[PDB]
Design a protein around this ligand. Structure first.
Ligand SMILES: *[C@@H]1O[C@H](CO)[C@@H](O[C@@H]2O[C@H](CO)[C@@H](O[C@@H]3O[C@H](CO)[C@@H](O[C@@H]4O[C@H](CO)[C@@H](O[C@H]5O[C@H](CO)[C@@H](O[C@H]6O[C@H](CO)[C@@H](O)[C@H](O)[C@@H]6O)[C@H](O)[C@@H]5O)[C@H](O)[C@@H]4O)[C@H](O)[C@@H]3O)[C@H](O)[C@H]2NC(C)=O)[C@H](O)[C@H]1NC(C)=O
Ligand SMILES: *[C@@H]1O[C@H](CO)[C@@H](O[C@@H]2O[C@H](CO)[C@@H](O[C@@H]3O[C@H](CO[C@@H]4O[C@H](CO)[C@@H](O)[C@H](O)[C@@H]4O)[C@@H](O[C@H]4O[C@H](CO)[C@@H](O)[C@H](O)[C@@H]4O)[C@H](O)[C@@H]3O)[C@H](O)[C@H]2NC(C)=O)[C@H](O)[C@H]1NC(C)=O
Ligand SMILES: *[C@@H]1O[C@H](CO)[C@@H](O[C@@H]2O[C@H](CO)[C@@H](O)[C@H](O)[C@H]2NC(C)=O)[C@H](O)[C@H]1NC(C)=O
Ligand SMILES: OC[C@@H](O)[C@@H](O)[C@H](O)[C@@H](O)CO
Ligand SMILES: OC[C@@H](O)[C@@H](O)[C@H](O)[C@@H](O)CO
Ligand SMILES: [Fe+3]
Ligand SMILES: [Zn+2]
Ligand SMILES: [Zn+2]
Length: 341
C-alpha cells in the first residue's frame, strides 16, 4: 500500500509538510485544511491517511472510528534503559501560568480576569481548565467566567475571541491554526508574555522552552522563568520549578491517528520516516528534521524525542484513559454518543 497522505492544519504546517514530502521522494504526500476538525473529516473520507493530535481531538476522532497509532515521546530521566520507540509514554503536565508581578492573582480569584488558551477542545488549553471551572462553579456558562479571552476555535464575535490577534494583516482572527498569533502552546504563552492576558493554560514544557534564552524569538528573547508563577488548585502560587506539585492534571501525549483499516500502513511508514528524519535520523541535522520548526510546533511538538509504539494495542478510550475521558464527557454535557460529523 506504501504511500501515506499527511494532513496539515493551515499554511505553515503545509509548507513544512511539502518539505518532508520532497525529502521523502513522495513516500509522504500532503493534504491541507483550515482546522484540525476538517483534517479529521478528510481522514474519514479517505483523502488523507493520518495526522498528530492533542488528546482533546483524539477524543473527537475516536468517536468517529479513528485510532491512535504511535505517540510522541519526549526525553525522560527514568526509563533510560529502554529505547525511545519501545519506551512507555509519560504524559505531560497541564499548568496555569501567570506573571509574578501580577501579585494576588490565584486560582481563587481567576473570575473576571483575562485568559489565554491554546485553542478550544484541547487538553491543557481548554478541557482540563474549563472542566475544573465548570465543576467548581456549578454552571455551564464558562463563556462568561473570564472577562475576555483568546480561545482559538470559538465565535470570533464573542468575548472568548476578544484577545486573539489574527495574522500579520489581522485576518483569520481566532482561527484555530497557527495563522493566529495566539494559537497553541506558544501562542497562548506569548499571549501572557505580552501581558495581553492575565493567565495562560499551557503545559510545563512551554514555560521552560520559551524562557531563559531557549527561544531567541523576538518576544521571548528576554523572558525569565523567575518572572513567572504557576497557579495550583489549593490557592497557592509556586515557581515554575515546582510543576510536579502544582499542576491541574497530567495529560496523555499527543498521538498520531488514522482510520483503523489504515493503521498498520501508517505505522510502518512512520517508523521508517523517523529512522531517516527523527532525532538521530540518517538525514536530520544535514537535510531535514521532522521534529524541528523553530519553537513553532508544526506537525509534531518540537520536544519530541521520537514517536513510540503503544503496546497493548489500545483503543482511544484506553489511550486517553478513564480519568480524562470522563472529564471531557462531563464538560461536553454543557456544550449524545455519536460522531460529530
Ligand atoms: C518541565 O519541562 C521541562 C522542559 O521539558 C523539563 O526540563 C527538562 O528535563 C529534561 C529531562 O527531564 C532535561 O534533559 C536532561 O538534559 C541533560 C543535559 O542538559 C541531558 O544530558 C544527559 O542525559 C543523560 C541520559 O539520559 C543523563 O544521565 C542519566 O543517568 C544518570 C545515571 O548516572 C542519572 O543521574 C543520576 O541522578 C538521579 C537524580 O537524582 C538519580 O536518581 C539517578 O540514580 C542517577 O544516578 C539519571 O537517570 C540521568 O537521567 C544525564 O544526567 C544528562 O542529563 C539529558 O537529555 C537529560 O534528560 C532537560 O535539560 C530539561 N529542559 C530544559 C530546557 O531545561 C522538566 O523536566 C519538566 N518538569 C516536570 C515536573 O516534568
Ligand atoms: C467534574 O465533575 C464530575 C462529577 O464528579 C467528575 O466526574 C467524576 O470523576 C470521578 C473520578 O474520575 C469518577 O469517580 C469514579 O471512581 C470510581 C472509583 O475509582 C476506582 O479506583 C480504583 C482504585 O482502587 C480502581 O481500581 C478502579 O478501576 C476505579 O477506577 C470508579 O469505579 C466505580 O465503578 C464501579 C462499577 O463496577 C462501582 O462498583 C464502584 O462503586 C465505582 O463507583 C468510577 O467508574 C468513577 O471513575 C466519577 O465516575 C465521575 N462522575 C461522573 C458523573 O461520572 C469529573 O471528573 C470532574 N471533572 C474534572 C476535570 O475534574
Ligand atoms: C520510500 O519508501 C520505500 C519503501 O520502503 C523505501 O525503499 C526501501 O528502503 C529500505 C531502507 O530505506 C530498503 O532497505 C528497501 O529494500 C527499500 N525497498 C522497498 C521496501 O521498496 C525508500 O527508502 C523510501 N524513500 C525515502 C527517502 O524515504
Ligand atoms: O499516553 C497514554 C499512555 O500511553 C498510557 O498507556 C500510559 O503509558 C499507561 O497507562 C501507564 O504508563
Ligand atoms: O494515560 C493513562 C492510560 O490511559 C491508563 O489509564 C489506561 O487506560 C489503563 O491503565 C489501561 O486500561
Ligand atoms: Fe496538548
Ligand atoms: Zn498530579
Ligand atoms: Zn485494550
Amino acid at each position: 500500500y506504501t504511500r501515506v497522505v499527511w494532513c496539515a492544519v493551515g499554511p505553515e504546517e503545509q509548507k513544512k509538510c511539502q518539505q518532508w514530502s520532497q525529502q521523502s521522494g513522495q513516500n509522504v504526500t500532503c493534504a491541507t485544511a483550515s482546522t484540525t476538525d476538517d483534517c479529521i473529516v478528510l481522514v474519514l473520507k479517505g483523502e488523507a491517511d493520518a495526522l498528530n493530535l492533542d488528546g482533546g481531538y483524539i477524543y473527537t476522532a475516536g468517536k468517529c472510528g479513528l485510532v491512535p497509532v504511535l505517540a510522541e515521546n519526549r526525553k525522560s530521566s527514568k526509563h533510560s534503559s529502554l529505547d525511545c520507540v519501545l519506551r512507555p509514554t509519560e504524559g505531560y503536565l497541564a499548568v496555569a501560568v501567570v506573571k509574578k508581578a501580577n501579585e494576588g492573582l490565584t486560582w481563587n480569584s481567576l473570575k473576571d480576569k483575562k485568559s489565554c488558551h491554546t485553542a478550544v477542545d484541547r487538553t491543557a488549553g481548554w478541557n482540563i481548565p474549563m472542566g475544573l471551572i465548570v465543576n467548581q462553579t456549578g454552571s455551564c456558562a464558562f463563556d462568561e467566567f473570564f472577562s475576555q479571552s483568546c480561545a482559538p476555535g470559538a465565535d470570533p464575535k464573542s468575548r472568548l475571541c476578544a484577545l486573539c490577534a489574527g495574522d500579520d494583516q489581522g485576518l483569520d482572527k481566532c482561527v484555530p491554526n497557527s495563522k493566529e498569533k495566539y494559537y497553541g502552546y506558544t501562542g497562548a504563552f506569548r499571549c501572557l508574555a505580552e501581558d495581553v492576558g492575565d493567565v495562560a493554560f499551557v503545559k510545563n514544557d512551554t514555560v521552560w522552552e520559551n524562557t531563559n534564552g531557549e527561544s531567541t524569538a523576538d518576544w521571548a528573547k528576554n523572558l525569565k522563568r523567575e518572572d513567572f508563577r504557576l497557579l495550583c488548585l489549593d490557592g497557592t502560587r509556586k515557581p515554575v520549578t515546582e510543576a510536579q506539585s502544582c499542576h491541574l492534571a497530567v495529560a496523555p501525549n499527543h498521538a498520531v491517528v488514522s482510520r483503523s483499516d489504515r493503521a498498520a500502513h501508517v505505522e510502518q511508514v512512520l517508523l521508517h520516516q523517523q529512522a531517516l528524519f527523527g532525532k538521530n535520523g540518517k538525514n536530520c541535522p544535514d537535510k531535514f528534521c521532522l521534529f524541528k520548526s523553530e519553537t513553532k510546533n508544526l506537525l509534531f511538538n518540537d520536544n519530541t524525542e521520537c514517536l513510540a509504539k503503544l503496546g497493548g494495542r489500545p483503543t482511544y478510550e484506553e489511550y486517553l484513559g478513564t480519568e480524562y475521558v470522563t472529564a471531557i464527557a462531563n464538560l461536553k454535557k454543557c456544550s449524545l454518543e455519536a460522531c460529530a460529523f
